């Protein structure tokens, strides 16, 4: 059927800058291209319908162009409230197909992560488990690398990593890293460490504990 290639996937820009998203259809689609905005947690919000006609209530700073296969959606000057995911939808032929989306990020000043490590809680050891958590908070850019070293030696088996979305207040990121491992394996070692290399530092910020 009709395929729609959207780009870029993710775009990092600073407040005020022009944002340009493009959607290209595999077949001539006329002017039946639609655009939606989606904030985290909420459902899609209709911004522009067929014929590049702005839906009522959408700021004039938004607009789209195109007829045929090449469609362009632009935001004159990105504001804070515009940071969201944008999707294009072709409504010319079934099946209705959406673009892959463009996730916007607020480009802000670099920031080092505030790292802290937690040894497993007593009641967890009791139930035979032993998880070691390490929080790296309020950093930026999102790109960071965590490594767990159980006594100088690195570990790769048993690590769970979760990142949060760009903070709606300071535009920073935070990630949780959890090293899970048998109570035995745990007790039979000593130095547990959480190594994190962030764009914001030449030396890998390290946080560890013993026993």
């Amino acid at each position: 059927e009709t395929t729609v290639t959207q780009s870029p996937a993710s775009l990092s820009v600073a407040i005020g800058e022009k944002v340009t998203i493009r959607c290209i259809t595999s077949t001539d689609i006329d002017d039946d291209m639609n655009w939606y905005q989606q904030k985290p947690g909420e459902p899609p919000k209709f911004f522009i319908s067929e014929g590049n006609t702005l839906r009522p209530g959408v700021p004039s700073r938004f607009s789209s162009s195109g007829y045929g296969t090449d469609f362009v959606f632009t935001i004159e000057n990105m504001l804070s409230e515009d940071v969201a995911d944008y999707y294009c939808l072709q409504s010319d032929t079934l099946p209705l197909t959406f673009g892959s989306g463009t996730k916007l990020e607020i480009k802000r000043a670099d920031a080092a992560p505030t790292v802290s490590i937690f040894p497993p809680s007593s009641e967890q050891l009791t139930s035979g488990g032993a998880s070691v958590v390490c929080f790296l908070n309020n950093f930026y850019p999102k790109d960071i690398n965590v490594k767990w070293k159980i006594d100088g030696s690195e570990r790769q088996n048993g690590v769970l990593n979760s990142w949060t979305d760009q903070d709606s207040k300071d535009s920073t990121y935070s990630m949780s890293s959890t090293l899970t491992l048998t109570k035995d394996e745990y007790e039979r070692h000593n130095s547990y460490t959480c190594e994190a290399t962030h764009k914001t530092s030449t030396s890998p910020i390290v946080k560890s504990f013993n026993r």
């Binding site: 039946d32 639609n34 939606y36 459902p43 899609p44 919000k45 209709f46 319908s49 067929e50 839906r55 999707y87 939808l89 409504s91 079934l94 099946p95 209705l96 197909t97 959406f98 892959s100 989306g101 505030t114 802290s116 937690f118 497993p120 809680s121 007593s122 009641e123 967890q124 139930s127 998880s131 958590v133 929080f135 908070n137 769970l160 990593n161 979760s162 990142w163 949060t164 935070s174 990630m175 949780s176 959890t178």
Partner: protein
């Protein structure tokens, strides 16, 4: 003002069946085409089915035809999606949406969405573990629950600033997530800091106090 509220999302075994419903208000229902769109974090928005205002025509994409069935009740102003032979791949957030046209068209209005989870995993409450060690940072580990969601607050919502709750990550069988809160050093442990976790699926609600080891 247009309003669409769906319900029926739930945990279901593979091959099982479900019937999502969508209540529509604020507009003359029998005049518009209605539809169901689903969304996943790895495949994005995906049109599932559409039905005409009269109910005469119904359209479906290949991957879902034969198993899903859309239908409408123009008297009750309700939309339905009958799902059968669910696959692990049908796990997604399902949105109820309206078409601006009488048949099919683009989507102008969307409901809040209901989430469906197809899995053989059993409902299981989470084990809550307190994470104890300028300002200090404390955390809470919610481990091994299923399905989603789980609600995490600190001091029953009294501690709002400085809280970071990370997205649950599907483990092998169960989910697990963590939350961290940071407070002035003068307030802990001189003041108690409890972490509360509610897992509605199992009607469980745990309150774990973060005490210094």
């Amino acid at each position: 003002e247009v309003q669409l509220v769906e319900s029926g999302g739930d945990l279901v075994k593979p091959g099982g069946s479900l019937k999502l419903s969508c209540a529509a208000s604020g507009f003359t229902f029998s005049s518009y085409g209605m539809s169901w769109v689903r969304q996943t974090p790895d495949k994005g928005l995906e049109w599932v089915a559409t039905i005409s205002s009269g109910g005469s025509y119904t359209y479906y994409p290949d991957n879902v035809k034969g198993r899903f069935t859309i239908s409408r009740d123009n008297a009750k102003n309700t939309l339905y999606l009958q799902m059968s032979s669910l696959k692990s791949e049908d796990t997604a957030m399902y949105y109820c949406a309206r078409h601006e046209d009488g048949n099919w068209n683009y989507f102008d209005y969307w409901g809040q969405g209901t989430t469906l989870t197809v899995s053989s995993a059993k409902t299981t409450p989470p084990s809550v573990y307190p994470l104890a060690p300028s300002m200090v940072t404390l955390g809470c580990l919610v481990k091994g629950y299923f399905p989603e969601p789980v609600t995490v607050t600190w001091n029953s919502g009294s501690l709002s600033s400085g809280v970071h709750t990370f997205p649950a990550v599907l483990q092998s069988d169960l989910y697990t997530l963590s939350s961290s809160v940071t407070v002035p050093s003068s307030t802990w442990p001189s003041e108690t800091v409890t972490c509360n976790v509610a897992h509605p699926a199992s009607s469980t609600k745990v309150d774990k106090k973060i005490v210094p080891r």
